[PDB]
Structure formats: C-alpha cells, structure tokens
Amino acid sequence: LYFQGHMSTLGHQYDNSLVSNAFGFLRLPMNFQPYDSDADWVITGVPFDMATSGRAGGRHGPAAIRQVSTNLAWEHNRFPWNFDMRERLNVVDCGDLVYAFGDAREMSEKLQAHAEKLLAAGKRMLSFGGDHFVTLPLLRAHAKHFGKMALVHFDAHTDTYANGCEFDHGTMFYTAPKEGLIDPNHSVQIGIRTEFDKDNGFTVLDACQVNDRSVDDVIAQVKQIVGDMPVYLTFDIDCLDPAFAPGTGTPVIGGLTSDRAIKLVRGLKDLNIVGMDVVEVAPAYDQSEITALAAATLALEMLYIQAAK
Amino acid sequence: STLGHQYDNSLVSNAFGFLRLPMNFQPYDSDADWVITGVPFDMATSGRAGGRHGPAAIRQVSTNLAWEHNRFPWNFDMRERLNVVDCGDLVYAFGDAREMSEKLQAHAEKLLAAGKRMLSFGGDHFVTLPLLRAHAKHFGKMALVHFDAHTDTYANGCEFDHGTMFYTAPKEGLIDPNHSVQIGIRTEFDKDNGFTVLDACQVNDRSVDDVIAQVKQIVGDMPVYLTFDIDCLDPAFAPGTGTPVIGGLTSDRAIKLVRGLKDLNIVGMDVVEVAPAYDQSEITALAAATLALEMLYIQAAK
Amino acid sequence: NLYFQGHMSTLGHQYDNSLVSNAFGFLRLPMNFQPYDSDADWVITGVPFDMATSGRAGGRHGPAAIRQVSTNLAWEHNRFPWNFDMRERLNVVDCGDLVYAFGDAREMSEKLQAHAEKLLAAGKRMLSFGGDHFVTLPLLRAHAKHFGKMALVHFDAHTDTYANGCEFDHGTMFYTAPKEGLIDPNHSVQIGIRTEFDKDNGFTVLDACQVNDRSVDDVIAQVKQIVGDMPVYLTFDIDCLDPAFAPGTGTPVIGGLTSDRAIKLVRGLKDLNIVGMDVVEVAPAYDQSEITALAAATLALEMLYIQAAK
Amino acid sequence: MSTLGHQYDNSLVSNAFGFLRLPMNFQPYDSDADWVITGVPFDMATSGRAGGRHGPAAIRQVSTNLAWEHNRFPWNFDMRERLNVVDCGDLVYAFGDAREMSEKLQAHAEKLLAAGKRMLSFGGDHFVTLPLLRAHAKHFGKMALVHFDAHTDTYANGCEFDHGTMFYTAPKEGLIDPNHSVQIGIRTEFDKDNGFTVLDACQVNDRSVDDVIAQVKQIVGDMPVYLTFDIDCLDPAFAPGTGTPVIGGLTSDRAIKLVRGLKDLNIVGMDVVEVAPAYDQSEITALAAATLALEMLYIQAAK
Amino acid sequence: STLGHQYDNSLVSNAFGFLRLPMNFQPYDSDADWVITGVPFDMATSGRAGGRHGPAAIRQVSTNLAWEHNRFPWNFDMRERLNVVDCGDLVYAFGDAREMSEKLQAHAEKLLAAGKRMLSFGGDHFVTLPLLRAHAKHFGKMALVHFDAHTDTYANGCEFDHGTMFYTAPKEGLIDPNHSVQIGIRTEFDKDNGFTVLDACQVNDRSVDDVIAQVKQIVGDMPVYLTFDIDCLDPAFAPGTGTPVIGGLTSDRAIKLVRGLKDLNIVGMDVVEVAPAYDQSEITALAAATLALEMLYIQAAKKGE
Amino acid sequence: MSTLGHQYDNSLVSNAFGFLRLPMNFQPYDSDADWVITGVPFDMATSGRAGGRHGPAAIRQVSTNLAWEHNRFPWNFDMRERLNVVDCGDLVYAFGDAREMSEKLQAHAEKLLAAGKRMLSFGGDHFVTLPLLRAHAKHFGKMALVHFDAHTDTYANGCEFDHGTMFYTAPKEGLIDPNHSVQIGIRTEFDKDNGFTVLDACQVNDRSVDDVIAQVKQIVGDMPVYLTFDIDCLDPAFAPGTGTPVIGGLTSDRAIKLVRGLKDLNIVGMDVVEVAPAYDQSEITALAAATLALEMLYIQAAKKG
Ligand SMILES: [Mn+2]
Ligand SMILES: [Mn+2]
Ligand SMILES: [Mn+2]
Ligand SMILES: [Mn+2]
Ligand SMILES: [Mn+2]
Ligand SMILES: [Mn+2]
Ligand SMILES: [Mn+2]
Ligand SMILES: [Mn+2]
Ligand SMILES: [Mn+2]
Ligand SMILES: [Mn+2]
Ligand SMILES: [Mn+2]
Ligand SMILES: [Mn+2]
C-alpha cells in the first residue's frame, strides 16, 4: 500500500478522484532522500529552460506532469496492460533538483552528481524536464554506470548542432557521441521534421514516413538498429504535432498523434532501457493540460514497459 | 428564431435554441417529433466539473451549422423531415443531485408518453441513467452504442457517480450488455461482462467501414440508445471535457462512425461531458454540436 | 408580471435560481422576436456588428456574451443596492439580434434605424447591446426624430469626434451626430476620456485622470448641470473601464475607471430623463473569464433600474 | 526539508508541493504542529460555475512566489520561527457524495481541535465552512464571524448542500452570533433585519482602511472569531478565478490591509474558499488567496 | 534584418518581416522575385472577425522556421534561389471595404507589371478576389487550386462577402471552374458548377499521391492560382479561424498535398482566414507560416539551382 | 513612413513593426536619432516564470493602439516632432549564453552613448539593466536610480546572472548612489539599512501622487537619473504578464501619473522590463508597458521643449 498511492493522502485513504491529493507523480510517495530508499525507480524534476532557443517556460514542466498525472492514478492496471506497475516496481518521486536559477553550470554539475549517486545506489531513473539540455548531464552519469548507450530519441529536431554555446538544448547529440556517451550507429531519431544531417551515424525516421508506416514496422526497424546495446530513451514532447502538444518551446507542424506515440513507446517493451526522460513541456503555452497529459501518460507507459520485464 | 423572423445567413447572430430551432418551454403538447433538452449537471464528476455549462456552449456554437440548408454530406434538409424544438434546460435545485435525477426522468417519461423522441445535451454522463430509466419504460430493454474513453461499469461508486451508469443500467434491466458496443475505450475496463469493447487503439488502426459492420452485427435489430461521451475524441479535438485521455478518435473518424449508424433503429440519444471552462476556441462544443446534428440527420435518413 | 419576470423563460415555466441554466434572453427576460405590438415598456436589441472598428474586431459576439453572463444577476429578486425589482415595475422583452447581410454596413445602418423608429413609433424605449460604437449613430438618428435633439451622457476612453475617416467609422459618430442635429454638444459630457481629444468643441470632457481622483457625488452634480433638463441618450463604451476590468474590447487604454466607480456613476444618473441607452464595444474573443461581459450586463441592468426608480 | 537533498530552494518555481513548501504530514493529529493546512476539493454545492475542487492545489502551486520571503512583507519576523505549520493534504471523500464530504471534514476538524491543533483550510466552495464551524463551535463555543464575500449566504430555503445557506444554518445551530458578526464586501441582495452588520463593497471602497477596521473590532468585541474569506470578495479584475463573480469589489491592496489590521482579534480558526482555477488568469486569483492565507498565519504568529 | 546585421539563430528575436526577410515598403522597383503582402481585413466575414491580425501573427511565429538553412525536407535554401521581400501591410480606411478592394488590386497590378510575383497573407478570403482581378489581367484566365472547408460559390450575399469570390471570379472570367479543384470541403456545396470538389471525408481516406495525381489532371496546362483557407485544416490543428468545421485535414496531410504540387505552374498564391484572437499557442499561425514557406519552396524547386 | 507605399496608417492594427510605427534603424550609431529603442530578448536570470524574452516583440505589437494619437493624452505636443526616435530591433546573442548578452548589450549601449544617442530599452528580465547601468555610468558618471518594482533586487548571495541582485552589484561598482536613489511599489521583504529610500506599495496607494513625486524629486536632487520600471510594480490585475507577480500593487492610473510627474528630472537613460507575454491577458501588460514607455519619451520631449 506504500509504493501504491494508498499512503500519500490525508489519513492514508485511497483517493479514487481524478483531482485531489496531487503531490508526487501518480500520487507516488515523496522521498527527498531517495539514495538509501527501497526504490527500484526514482522520478526527478529538472526545473530548467535557460538553454532554450525558442519559448521559455520548460521550468514548470515537472509540476504540470505531476499535477495532471492524477487523471491516470485511478487505473489499477493502466490500459491496456494486464497488471499494476506499482505492484512490480517500487517508484518514489524525489521532488525537483535545487540549483541557483541563472546558473546553468551549477544545474549541470548538480544534476550529474544527483544521477551518479542514484545509479551508484542501484536505482534507475525516470526524469522530467525542463528543456532537452538536462538529458546531456543525465547521459554523462548513465554512460559511466552502464557504458556507451543506443539513444532512442523522440523529437521534431535532431539536436546535433556543432556550433552552439555550451548551454544549448540543440547540441546534446553532437556532444554525447563526441564524449562517447552514445553510439550514433545504434541510435534512432523518430518524428524528425526540421533540417537535419544525413551522413552522421544516426538513423532518422522522419514524421512524414512515420505517419505513413505501421507502428509494428517502425518498432521492428528500431529493435534491429539498437542491437543489444543498453538503451537510453528520451522523449521530447514536440515529437507530438502541436495539435496534441501545443505547450512546447519549439513547436513544428506535421507531427505524430498521441495514439501513434503511445503505441511506439508501448512497442519498445522488449529492449534493455537503463534510463529514460520526458522533456520540453512548457505549461505557459499548454491548453487544458493536454501537453502535460501526453507527457504523464508517456511517462507512465515508460514505467509499464520496465514492469513488463 | 430571429428579430422580425428574418432569415439569418450569419454564423454568429441570433444564437438562442440549438441550430436556431424554435424555443418551446412546454414541448409536451407541441407538434415536435424530436425534443432537445439541456441537463446543466456535473455533481457526479470524478475529474473536472464545468459540464453544467455544456448545453449553452453547444447551442451558442451551433450557429456555425445553421446556414447549411442541406448539412454535408446529406442530400436533404433534416428540418423539412423533422419538427425539432429546443425546450430549454432542466430546472433542479443545484446541489440536489437526487432532485435532478427525479425531475429528468419525469420530464423524459412525459415527453415519450406524448410520442416525442429526445436528443439530450449534458452535463456529466450520469444524466444518461435517468434518460435510460424513462426510455426503458416506453421502448423496453435497449442496445447501448456508447462512445467514450471510459466504460463506466464501476460497482463501488456512490449513488451519483458518472462512472457507474452502465453497471446500474444492466442490473435495472434497462439495457442488454450482450448487444451493447463501447467505442473509443482506452482506460482500464472489466473484460468479463457482456459488452463488446472496441478500444481506441484498434478503432484508430482498423477501417471505419469494418468497425460499422461489426457494431451492426452486435446490436442486431434491438432498439438502440446512442450515448456519446465527448472525451471519446482525443483531447486535441475535445480539450473541453472533465476527464481527458490521450490516444482518442479524430473528429473525422467520430462523425464517419455516427454517420454509418443510420440503418440502426435509434429510439433516443445524447452528447455529454462538454466542459466549456476547459474548451479552446469552442472546438469541443462544435464537435458535440456537429455530432448532435449528425444524430438528427441519421433519424431524418429514415 | 410573471411572463416579464422570467418565470416563463425556462423548461416547464419553473423559476431558475441557478446562475447557469436557461441562458437565452438577457436576465432570462422573455424572447419577443416581434416586439413592436407587445406590452413591453423597454426592448433589448443585440447589434452583432464590428465592421466599423479601427482596432480589434469581435464586437459582433458582444450581445451573446452579455446575455450568457447575465444569469449571474437574475437570482437577485431586488438587485443590490435597490429595494425594489425592476422586472415588476418594467415590462422588458429581448427581441434578439438585428438580421443584416454580414459585410454590408449600409444595410445594418438602414435596418437598425428602421427597427429603432418602429419601436419608438410603437411607444417602446430601447436598451441596445453592441457591437462597435458606430451602432449608436443609427440609434441617435431614430431617437432624434422622436424625442428631438438630446444631451449625450457618453462613457468612453475616446471622444469619437474624428471629422475625417470613412462613413462606417466607430470614432466619428459624435462629429456626425451634432452635424445632423441629433445631439447638443453644449449639454453633452464625455466621461473616462484618456486619449487625445478636441478641447474647443461644445462637449464637456471629464478625463479619467480627474474622474479617478474626484468624488462620485461631484462628477454626478456636474453631469446634472451640463445636461440641464433636455432628454438624455446614455451611450456606454465598456473601454471606459480600465483593461483590468474590461480586457475584452477592441481599443483598450490604461488608466481607466474601476467597475465600482462606473456602476456608482450610472446609479447617480437616476434623476435624469434618459429616453434611450446602449452598452457597446464588448469583444468576447479578448474577454478573460467573462469579466468584461459581466461589467456590461451589470451596468445595462443598472440602466434599467434607474428607469424603474421613477 | 521539503526539497531534493533537503536544499534551500531560493527559486519561485521549484519543489511546489505543500503550501509555502511547508512539511507534508498526512497524519498531523499526533504531530508537533501549532497550525494544520487542509484542502477540501469540493464544488457540488455551487449555484454558479463549478471548478472550486481544484482550489487547494492552485493555492499550493502558486505559493512558491511567497516562500522565498524570510520575513514576508511587511512583517519584522518569520511566521515559521514562531508557528510550526504542516500541510496534511486534501480530504479524501467519494466524489458525488456531498454528505460523506461534510461528515468526514467535521470528523477531521474535531480530531485536529481535540489534539490541540488549529486549522487553516482551503476550499473548494463556501459550504465547507459549515462543517468547519460545526467542529470549531463544539471546541471553542459560539463564535463571531468576520466574513469576506460579495454575498451574505444567509438563504433559508436552499437544499441541504447549498454554498449560499451556511450563515442561515450556523446561527440556527448556535455556531455563530450574528450580533458580533460582520460581512465585508457585500454587493448582492442581502437580508437587512438579521443581527449581521453588512459593510457593503460600496462603503468599504469609499471609507478608509483604518475606520473600517476600528468598526469591525467594535462589533466582534472579545468573542472568539472564525475568519472566512470567499475570494469573490475581491473584484473580478483581481479574482477572476471564482464560480460567482460580482463587479465593484475590493482591491487586493484594501483586502490584505483589512486582514493585516485584524491581528489583535482572538481568531480561533480560518479558511479561504471559492478559488476556481479553471476560470483563473495567470494564477492571480490563486496568488491573492495564497497571499491572504499567509497573512492569516502572520496575524496568528504576531501573538 | 537584425541589430548590427548579425545572424539571429534564435527562434524568438528580431520578428519583423516574414522569416526575418528584408522589409521593402516600395517593392515595385526592387530586385525582388517574390513580394509578401499583408492584407489586414475581415469586414467580409460571416462568422468570427479578427482575421485583420492574420499577417502579423504569421510574421511573428515565422521565427520558428528561419533557423533552418534547408527547410525540411528540401535539399536547398529557397533564399539562395528567390529574392524575397516583405512590403508590409495594405493601408486602407478601416470601415471602407471598397477602398481595400480597389487599393489591393491597384497594388497587385503594379507588382505584376514590374515583374514581381505575389505571396499574400490574409485576412478573410475576400482579399483573393481583388488579387485574381490583377492576376487575370497579367496571366489571363487561371486554374484555381483551392484548399478550404467551404466552396465559397454563394450566389446572392452582399458585395463584400468572404463566401462569394468563386461565384464572382468565374463570371468576370478570372478563373475556369472546369480546370479548378476545391480540396477539404465538408459543408453544403453546389455539385454542378464545373468545380471538381474533393471533400475532407474522401481526402482523409485516400492516399496523398492519388489526390496529387488527380489535381494535376484537372488543372491541365493552365497557369495556377493557389489559395489556402486555413480552416481547410481540422480545428484541432487550426482553431484560430472565423468559421471552423470539424473533420478537417491534419497539418501533415496539408503540407504533404501542397509539397506534391511542385511541378504545377503556380503564378500567384495566398494563405487566408488566420484569426489570432481564437488561435492557441500560435499553432494556426504556425501552420499558415509553414505552408507559406512551403509555397515559396515549390517555386524555388520549380525554379533551378 | 514604415508602411506599404509609405502611407499614413490611422488603424490600431496594421503595419505593426517598430515601436509606435517608428522607423527601423539596425545601424543607429551614425543616424540623426536623439533616442534609440533596443529590445533585449533575455529571461535567463529569472527566479520565477520565464517568458520575458518575448517582451520586446509584445510591446512593439501593442504600441499600434498609441500611434494614432498625434498629441498623446494628456500632452499638448507630439514627441515625434521634438525627438527623433528609431527602433534598432533586438540585441543578437547566443541563447543560453547570459555572459554574451551582458557584454554585447554593454558594448551596444557604450557605442550608442559614445555617438550621443540616448537609450529607451525593452526587456527581458531586470538583469539587463546592470549591463545598461555600466554603459551609462562610463558616459554620465554615478547616477540616482528611480526604480519602480514590487522587489528591491539587492540580494547579495545570488549567482552572477540573477535578476534580483543588480542594485547590490550596481552601487558596489560605483554606477548608482543609493542615498539619491528611490524604490517605488515594494511589497516584498527588503533591507531597510541600505542608503535606498523604499516607498512601499501600501503607503504609495494611501498617499497622493503629488506628495510622492515631491519626495522623489528631493531624494534625487540634481544627480543624473536612470529610470528603470519593472512592470510587476503594477498589481497583477493590471500586469498579469510578469515572471514574479505580487498582489497589492499600483493601478496603471497611479503608475502613469507618477512617471508623468518625474518630467522635471534629468533622466539620462530608462528601460521597461519583466513583460512576459506567455502570462499576459489580452495584451493588457504589454499595453501598460508600451504606454509607460511612450510616457517616458513625452517627459523627455517635455523637458527638451
Ligand atoms: Mn529536443
Ligand atoms: Mn525538439
Ligand atoms: Mn462517460
Ligand atoms: Mn469518459
Ligand atoms: Mn467609442
Ligand atoms: Mn472607446
Ligand atoms: Mn459564497
Ligand atoms: Mn461569494
Ligand atoms: Mn474560404
Ligand atoms: Mn472556409
Ligand atoms: Mn525586478
Ligand atoms: Mn520585480
């Protein structure tokens, strides 16, 4: 009942409402010292958007994902699954990373040291952004513990820009391969629909072709691409068409549906995913929490494919 | 209709009754074939409230549809085949859910006993239960065609719970689950009842024509009650609802499905869970309004 | 008076105590789409028109928004702070919205003037909902023929005395109205003005800067003096209110009146002989939680109460 | 210690959980708390717009704007130095059952008061105040009501669960004394010949802060006070996020100054109600409620 | 077109001309191949107004696209092939629709005569009628490739009505209905007027290639005027529009259907009916911005390297 | 004019480019301008909500509501007739590099002031003012700060790029004299024991505009004044579009009257900061900022004569 959500309400009463007792993601228990806990998975918020080239507001993403997640908490077995992920995984929400707002360098180092300490304690990580730069420190900690990783990357942009400043949310996947964190030749970038480089190692499955092909065919290609490398899964929510995810800093039309998106994440269940994150929710631009809702449903789906093991 | 009873070609002005249809606040002894009733109720919601403003938002946006003499893609005017009146909204003591339930059933029972039929606007989905209780008394046991992200077959809810109507309605002999279909479902459901659950995942993958064919086989020749929860539509098309769930139907798939149910003997129908407080540029109200008009056009198709 | 109190404006003719449902006619007053031969003392007309706007359009939705939000004021049997019910003292019907070819401002002008003259020539008085402020000029033309030259009690951030610009221009009515002998500038006051105006015309401009500092009683005393004892036409542009209170308008100007000051000022005009009145420039596309519409509905209701006070 | 790694969060954004990032205590009855914050996610008794059920969460979320202030303006101490405040979460009741809410909130309130704890409560619609008054009156006896609202809510022929009937019922049950009670900001039809003293928005906006405050102190005398604040007391310009808005209301300046000047009153319990986030604009209603809520703890801390 | 003529790689700053292109308020005598004109006008609307803010909304949001050297999925920069200038917005007395109509045509005739081509941002769809009057003088009778939820072939109506241009234009001999296609229609339409209607229902169920294959067959060898009404897109993608109709196109299918008209002789074009007061997080304006950029790219593609 | 064909645009909508439809001058250093408007699209220093980067563009777009007034109320002349004002667009820095912003803004500010141009700057968060003070202090010497805000921003234990620290760093670096400086509208925890005179929101609301202006004039005396206006000085009802809102602020009425009354002061530079359009409601925050911006140009034109 602790690790379920029966235990994070007033008087520890099971809150059946899709509204009340909205604190931790999915009403999962708060543990602000997660390093010595009995958690299998530790949810972290990264309230950061200093590395944005478009709209800011990403700093409020972790809160929005948590707030809207009460819509999913009532499902004992989250559809369409035949078990409860809370019975299989012990998940805690450790709150948001504390850093000096206006110091991206302090954010970077403290986030890297946070992950390094979790991973060294045998805890796995589901992380909420924040702009997509937060994924770089996370990959620096993950590469140290799990080795070089295949990147499964849901996005409208490839973020492989070579001539940006240090704190730039469009330069993580130029920097990660350069530092030997990820292998481009085993990495896949799904839903791309902005200018990208073709003759790097990355396999780009653009939104045009992904919206035309079947989910099972895209999945089969992804399964082959990654091989047997440990996967880091990163979902930029601007992968979804702005009709489904208006609340992003860099929106691009001709994106994926929320249906196609959840089906693709659902289908990655057989892979070795060591870490994952959902980034770039900007609630200042969200409409009736639909962007936040997509991020939270995808976040819960990521936990369910780990529980599927 | 309008000031000076002048034909209003605008998509804006003289927004009163749904589709600028005549207001008849005493519709029981009227010449009407079909009666539009608003149920301004959301006390049985488990998610967001705001459903109480549902009927108003659906009426206001319906001016967008009114100018169409023949509504696309139909070859006739449904107003030339049906006398439809808008009888206003149910008056009940707000905060008294029991009084709502009693007054809605009596209203419906009085309408049906006058040989009138009912297109109802919610309001949360609990309003369907009083509507089913009255329809059952006049039309007997019914087949349920139920568009939704949720099955609403919960057995441990309080009396006024918008997730319990289709646990209670089978028990009360109002509907036959074995001839009932549930379309758009994408939240935890009990597989081991009579209902055929056509989940959003498969309905989005399958063809519209092969979904329709299967619905027809299930319902058979039973008289249908057509209930449309608007959170069936993906929050991208229907943000203005109390319990949104991602991975839902497009408005295109939704209208095509409702359009292809014309051959069924549909005795009653409603559109529920429109929450204008959460709606964006009236796109949810519009979908609810357009689907409601489609329901009158499939009745007119007879 | 049950018909005119809104006991017959709901399903089964049941009194709706809720601030939500049966939102049709303003304040749930009965719909009369042929109001000319009715028992109505006062007739409410929507003018869904914004073609004459210089800023944002969307004024055309003003009438509908004012009606929908007005259910918030219906539950009060005696509207505060009055000790009677205006619905029991006045027969008030809502005749709906003016039907005109959208994109034809001339037809709007002619049909509105024809509609108004027919109401006045039937012994009815008019409370009109805009729409942009140009709707006042057709209404002033109808009123001028029936009651004679009037005193304009004008609430606005703008004087709208522009002697240039095209015919269908919502900043020109009160240059045109004096020229056609519809109003007397000498007995006219413009309240809330905080945009460039002509000082040396006959109008008395009580700018928002001084109106915000001065007492209500003192502004009221001055307005009473300016009008004299001529018949008054009361036009209220909602953008008179600060954007804080009325964000839903086409031409917002900061440093406006509070809703508290505006409702008090109209309340203090009760002694004046107001022969016709309107509320204009509600643009619901730019409104925020119906706060502009609510202001327009309350002020419009106050205009009916200061007629009922007599 | 309500942040990751128990670090001091100087931002006005991060770690937005308990009100003002105060410690979460879901079993606060046997705790060390002087004051307990409860959320009541309820809006079934609403006559206008619903959406009050999200009130508690929106007040908590926006309260990150106020937490960075060690001495919240304009005070010369920290209320966390003098008071031990805890956020006990939201009342768990069956959504659709108004009776379950009422009984469980009274039981919650009665256990807190019997345990020596005092209650700041966020609504939710104003009906929640009656179960809270029922609890308070058992423990503290008959009370004076300092009531901020656009409405007097003294309706006599409403249904059981009506957010406009509490202050007909509360004198009827001997919970409050109208003769020592005041209703500040009323600008809607009210009954004149009840014991209540109504300081309507019209006279309050015209009169000075000091002369209004002095009159309120005269009325209450030395009676134990229950302070209740319906946010629609504020003008829709300042509080657009509410179920039943009325124009010609109080400014946030005048409102915070009135609450700040009630500090020498014997206030035994208080609440802030009718925040409806669905109708809010950039959280300014939530912020006003949240700021008023902290002000109420500071006037308690000043003692 | 930035402070100190520095390259602004941000998706935010220096949002003046469409895609930060140079402003040329007197473009007639310039080196321009393609001139962008804002027509801030919505007086002919029968639904909501606010289309007057369309051009500005399209310009502001266009910063999201400027950073792309080669706009996806193209293999060239359209700016390296076409000299493009934004000439600002048409200046007419607000409340005078005839002045707008006369000045928009007069402006259009001057550009065409000087050897400039036109990409025009609306504004309600009536702006297309004065444009076809200028284009039909310079290019003769044209084929209309029409993206819309409405056919706008309404006989009757007033003079200035955004649902009548394509009843008026054939009568005056600006367009040939028999070589004209109307894609995305999902409201009452006239079946026998020469126009080939491809309704949203069939468009959504058919393949992009097979619709493109048919559109080529219809327009023939005629010079094409491409007019995109943004309400062609489903309100889920284009909520900021005066007359929304449900069951529209995805932005995906829309850009895919335009992208596949690259071989057609498109002489002029416009994007209309963006009403920013009803838009949500600039998604309608962004669709209008992205589609406008695509229209320049199918001209940059059909023009050589 | 800055319109299609250089025509007079009397509309409050169209040709929305430079602030108040003033001419765009991207190289203003050698121009005939008296006053230059610069956008600083930067919000990286914020401790609350971000969005300030879009502030400059929002202020420009809303300023069309003010341009039609030849003599802006309640003035008896045109500032555009007395002052030569240009908009030089927005500062171009690598987004995510706060250091580059600071250095490039100072160098830009020093170059303008070295050429005899005066600065009206739009933020962006309030940190942008520290680079501006460094530049002004080099050309004018130590200045009296007239500072409208809900916050004093004198925090001594923040990171380098922090929007709540400028007026601790500024007096330390000899840019401003606290003893001749005033902070108007404060309603948050503040240090009382610094040289600054704090006129908190509660007292300013209770006092007459006359007696407050009288106090400010005495404090500054005859030192060169830098007028910096954080828009959150206004109550969130008037300015919801801000990053760190605080209830119980000034009305837009009181705020303009207070600025209007500073006309006799020697104000050498000025800025308006912390407009976050993501949190604005029907542009009312941008309008207030744009109107207060225009008022600052009028009190300069008034003093100039
Ligand atoms: Mn990314
Ligand atoms: Mn991205
Ligand atoms: Mn349902
Ligand atoms: Mn449902
Ligand atoms: Mn006016
Ligand atoms: Mn005006
Ligand atoms: Mn109340
Ligand atoms: Mn109240
Ligand atoms: Mn069209
Ligand atoms: Mn259209
Ligand atoms: Mn500041
Ligand atoms: Mn500040």
Author numbering:
A (entry chain E): -5 to 303
B (entry chain F): 2 to 303
C (entry chain B): -6 to 303
D (entry chain D): 1 to 303
E (entry chain A): 2 to 306
F (entry chain C): 1 to 305
According to the publication:
Agmatine amidinohydrolase, or agmatinase, catalyzes the conversion of agmatine to putrescine and urea. This enzyme is found broadly across kingdoms of life and plays a critical role in polyamine biosynthesis and the regulation of agmatine concentrations. Agmatinase belongs to the family of arginase enzymes and exhibits the characteristic 8-stranded, parallel β-sheet sandwiched between 3 α-helices on either side. As a metallohydrolase, agmatinase is dependent on Mn2+ ions for catalytic activity, two of which are bound at the active site in high- and low-affinity sites to serve in activating a nucleophilic water molecule for catalysis.
Here we describe the high-resolution X-ray crystal structure of the E. coli agmatinase, SPEB. The data showed a relatively high degree of pseudomerohedral twinning, was ultimately indexed in the P31 space group and led to a final model with eighteen chains, corresponding to three full hexamers in the asymmetric unit. The protomer of SPEB comprises an α/β/α sandwich with an eight-stranded parallel β-sheet between two sets of three α-helices. An additional α-helix runs roughly perpendicular to the plane of the sandwich structure. The hexamer has D3 symmetry, with very little structural variation between protomers. The RMSD for an all-atom superposition of the SPEB protomers onto one another range from 0.162 to 0.181 Å. In the first two hexamers of SPEB that were built into the model (ABCDEF and GHIJKL), a pair of unambiguous spheres of electron density, presumed to be metal ions, were visible in each of the chains. The last hexamer (MNOPQR) also showed likely metal ions at these sites in each protomer, but the density was not as clear. As such, these regions were modeled as a dinuclear Mn2+ site in the structure of SPEB. The metal ions are octahedrally coordinated by a pair of histidine residues (H126 and H151), and four aspartate residues (D149, D153, D230, and D232).
